[PDB]
């Protein structure tokens, strides 16, 4: 039940507790088999997202995790960095001629 806890800080510590390779296994089959033990019905509304969060985060350490999916771009072209506003705003909130 601490794995649905209201404070995101405690929600993270208990996730990080079960993720450890001694509490809950590292090979994918025994991980998939073991996750069925991480249930009681008081967790059910969240369970599917937790089981998948424990399987895909086993890839956080995988040798391909930082490789590119396709080796090189579509043709000769050049690329840049970028930034998105992401702070205080939805578009429909400031008047036109100002």
């Amino acid at each position: 039940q601490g794995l649905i806890d209201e404070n995101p800080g405690l929600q993270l510590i208990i996730r990080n507790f079960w993720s450890h390779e001694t509490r809950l296994p590292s090979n994918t089959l025994d991980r998939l088999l073991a996750l069925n033990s991480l249930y009681s019905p008081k967790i059910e509304v969240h369970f599917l997202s937790l089981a998948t969060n424990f399987l895909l985060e086993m890839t956080s350490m995988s040798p391909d995790y930082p490789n590119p999916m396709f080796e090189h771009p579509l043709s000769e072209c050049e690329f840049q960095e970028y930034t998105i506003d992401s702070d205080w705003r939805f578009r429909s909130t400031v008047l036109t001629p100002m």
Partner: protein
């Protein structure tokens, strides 16, 4: 949305390489990216669809099949291009700053020495020239004109 599974994607595990076919996620992720009223869900559904249409272009360009029928993923392109327009000129400014450049970026790629003759561009053209018609949106038509 397709007769047979495109997007076969091998999950990066250390023991093994199990396969997900990503073309099952689109019918729900497209609806989330437009219509999710919770803003934090919405933007995360966008960046999944962005990374998933990057995956799309790459997988098609390896030539999984080279024509001799419906080009691979034409049936996806016909279904995802109208979503990409409706979702550039979305209201949410974090969504707009992500997809206005991406549609112009796609529109550059879909004019090219081989690909200008492709039905990928026919699907694209007829998506945008249905975009300008829309009977219930004023800002979609402006964007599709600029497209």
């Amino acid at each position: 949305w397709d007769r047979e599974k495109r997007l076969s994607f091998a999950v990066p595990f250390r023991e093994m390489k199990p396969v997900i076919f990503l073309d099952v996620f689109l019918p729900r992720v497209t609806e989330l990216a437009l219509t999710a009223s919770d803003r934090q869900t919405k933007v995360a559904a966008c960046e999944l669809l962005h990374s998933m249409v990057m995956f799309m272009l790459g997988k098609a360009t390896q030539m999984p099949e080279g024509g001799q029928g419906a080009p691979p993923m034409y049936q996806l392109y016909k279904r995802t291009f109208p979503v990409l327009l409706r979702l550039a000129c979305d209201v949410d400014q974090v969504t707009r700053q992500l997809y206005e450049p991406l549609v112009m970026q796609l529109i550059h790629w879909f004019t090219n020495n081989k690909k200008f003759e492709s039905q990928d561009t026919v699907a694209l053209l007829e998506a945008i020239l249905d975009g300008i018609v829309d009977p219930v949106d004023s800002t979609l038509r402006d964007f599709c004109g600029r497209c």
